[PDB]
């Protein structure tokens, strides 16, 4: 369930609770890599009950490691590390976040995004209170060759081909009522995206597909 250094463990639902019922805020990252974008966002808010779920647990095990330490440290108890993926999430999970985030997603978790697939959007929606945004965040990059399999297969996702393709309607039967769609060059890809091979402030910028959602009532 819940990763605690570099293992998994199981999370008790009590403390599980007490968690919930001490945050100001819960937010949900779905798909996380190794999850230093999660981690970043727990410092940066401590108050938050940062939540990162994915399946390759094995890749969070650094972020947790350092997580784990004392606060003065670099510590942060406020991290969770889910290892499960969105489209069997648990029942513990459903209708906790008060914002879900997408950032840069990648395998099935974004290719499930651009075609709007039924469990991979609805496990999203599980998660979320109504009310809560979704926010999804790909860089345009990834159409450019060599296209990354899980999408090669695709036209490329823009504010246009997202309401021509039924996305938009797609969404919005799964209790997802699109807000605002658009592109945004010159996005600090260090802002969606973090990494613990990556040192910060390179600068680095790339043109970034935004998509925000509000969780409604399914169809």
Known sequence: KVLAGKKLTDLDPAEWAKAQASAER??????????????????????????????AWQRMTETAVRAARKPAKG???????????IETVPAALHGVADEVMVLMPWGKLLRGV???????????????????????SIGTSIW??????????????????????????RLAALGWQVADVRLVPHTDLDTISSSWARRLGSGATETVLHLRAVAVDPR
């Open 26 to 55: 819960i937010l949900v990252d779905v798909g996380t890599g190794d999850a230093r974008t999660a981690y970043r966002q727990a410092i940066a808010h401590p108050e938050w009950l940062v939540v990162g779920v994915d399946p």
């Open 114 to 136: 651009v075609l709007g697939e039924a469990d991979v959007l609805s496990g999203l929606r599980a998660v979320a209170k109504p009310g809560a945004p979704l926010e999804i």
């Open 144 to 169: 450019r060759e060599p296209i990354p399999l899980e999408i090669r297969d695709l036209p490329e996702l823009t504010p246009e081909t997202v309401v021509s393709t039924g996305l938009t309607d």
């Open 75 to 85: 510590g942060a108890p406020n991290l969770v590390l889910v290892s499960s993926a």
